């Protein structure tokens, strides 16, 4: 058949940002979320508040953070 016109629509967007570009970038923006949690654990390892609720419950790397000094060896 003969075509005499083009049929089209307009995609949802706001400025330089579009819905299609957001959908393509969405799976990779979650990996960057997980790469920032991993980098946060590295820098808060010495914080004892985070040790007692998160890091000491790791199966193999957990117990190696516990201190085993007897009370008779501590002045405070």
């Amino acid at each position: 058949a003969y075509t005499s016109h083009l049929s089209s629509k307009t995609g949802l967007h706001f400025g330089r940002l579009s819905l299609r570009s957001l959908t393509a970038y969405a799976p990779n923006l979650m990996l960057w979320g997980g790469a920032s949690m991993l980098g946060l654990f590295v820098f808060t390892e010495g914080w004892p508040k985070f040790q007692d609720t998160l890091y000491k419950k790791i199966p193999l790397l957990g117990p190696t953070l516990e201190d085993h000094t007897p009370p008779e060896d501590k002045p405070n």
């Binding site: 058949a1 003969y2 075509t3 005499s4 016109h5 083009l6």
Partner: protein, 352 residues
């Protein structure tokens, strides 16, 4: 309003609209060149950007070309988008916007680029003067616009009102159904154009013989000669051009180019010699002129020129019908002469 088409089982189609609005009908110097570079700008219903983006998604392109006789609007597209491109060309000839800022930002800078490119070639310069001294005010009008004569926006609008008329244009198509094209040409804005008059004049134009001109130029030296041709001697000069640039002639090594430009009322024969050293240009042009004065036998080149003419006419749709069966001899008479380059070391007309 002539409509014709040829059919074929292919994928691509071509549509052309030829208007008798070339440089030979220009009221002011270069006004036809300026109308060529406004052909696919904004219209009163669709923008230039919208047309480019829409046709790209449909598979088509647009172009406009200018010569001394025609202005041609062409569209190449896929075979099934025919009605879309009929109306796109109809809107161009009907309702072009002609905005003051389109001329300043798009049209004038495009025309400056065309003029600067052609000015750097000495062969284009020598051909322009040959047209100027042979025909003075008809075919001798300048092709491109250079700003020597002032052309305003109203001048371009006036020129379009005169050449874009229903009796002055033809519509042709390749790999297009003719019955369908005629339907779409009607019920279109082409059928509502003013019915003016054909600008074509049947009488033979006035020509001049024995003229000369010289232009100083930095680059390659060029020597050229030109001969006006009537309607009944077009075939004789068609064989001569092919013979002079073929292996059958000993002068083909000294000749850079040679052609016959054909019109509906006559033609012009051109021959060019181009070299960097002006001593070779002076020597080659003297040998060519002396040899042509004695006379040449063109019968051996008739069969060769029949095939070459078939090659060119495949693309064209309305070629000049020629015979070639009665071409026997040739002897040079009177001619015009132009020298471009280092003119102080190039010969004059009286020395040839």
């Amino acid at each position: 309003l002539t409509v014709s088409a040829r059919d074929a089982p292919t994928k691509i189609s071509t549509l052309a609209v030829k208007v008798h609005g070339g440089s030979r009908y220009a009221t002011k110097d270069g006004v036809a060149h300026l109308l060529n570079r406004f052909n696919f700008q904004n219209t009163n219903t669709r923008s230039a950007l919208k047309l480019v983006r829409e046709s790209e998604l449909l598979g088509g392109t647009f172009k406009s070309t200018l010569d001394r006789e025609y202005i041609t609007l062409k569209a190449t597209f896929l075979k099934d988008d025919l009605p879309y491109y009929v109306n796109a060309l109809a809107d161009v000839l009907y309702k072009t916007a002609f905005k003051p800022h389109e001329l300043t930002e798009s049209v004038l800078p495009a025309a400056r680029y065309d003029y600067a490119v052609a000015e750097q070639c000495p062969v284009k310069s020598a051909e322009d003067q040959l047209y100027a001294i042979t025909f003075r005010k008809g075919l001798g009008n300048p092709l491109l616009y250079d700003g020597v004569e002032r052309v305003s926006l109203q001048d371009i609008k006036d020129f379009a009102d005169k050449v874009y008329t229903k009796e002055n244009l033809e519509v042709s198509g390749e790999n297009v159904v003719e019955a369908d094209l005629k339907r779409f040409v009607d019920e279109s804005l082409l059928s509502t154009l003013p019915a003016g008059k054909s600008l074509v004049s049947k009488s033979e134009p006035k020509f001049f013989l024995g003229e000369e001109n010289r232009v100083r130029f930095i680059g390659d030296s060029v020597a050229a000669i030109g001969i006006p041709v009537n309607k009944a001697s077009l075939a004789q000069y068609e064989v001569l051009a092919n013979y002079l640039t073929s292996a059958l002639s000993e002068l083909s090594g000294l000749i850079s180019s040679a052609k016959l430009d054909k019109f509906t009322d006559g033609g012009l024969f051109t021959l060019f010699v181009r070299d960097q050293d002006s001593a070779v240009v002076s020597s080659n042009i003297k040998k060519i002129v002396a040899d042509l004065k004695k006379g040449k036998d063109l019968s051996p080149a008739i069969n060769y020129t029949k095939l070459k003419n078939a090659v060119q006419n495949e693309s064209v749709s309305s070629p000049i019908e020629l015979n070639f069966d009665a071409v026997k001899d040739f002897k040079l008479g009177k001619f015009n002469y132009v020298a471009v380059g280092d003119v102080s070391n190039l010969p004059y007309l009286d020395e040839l």
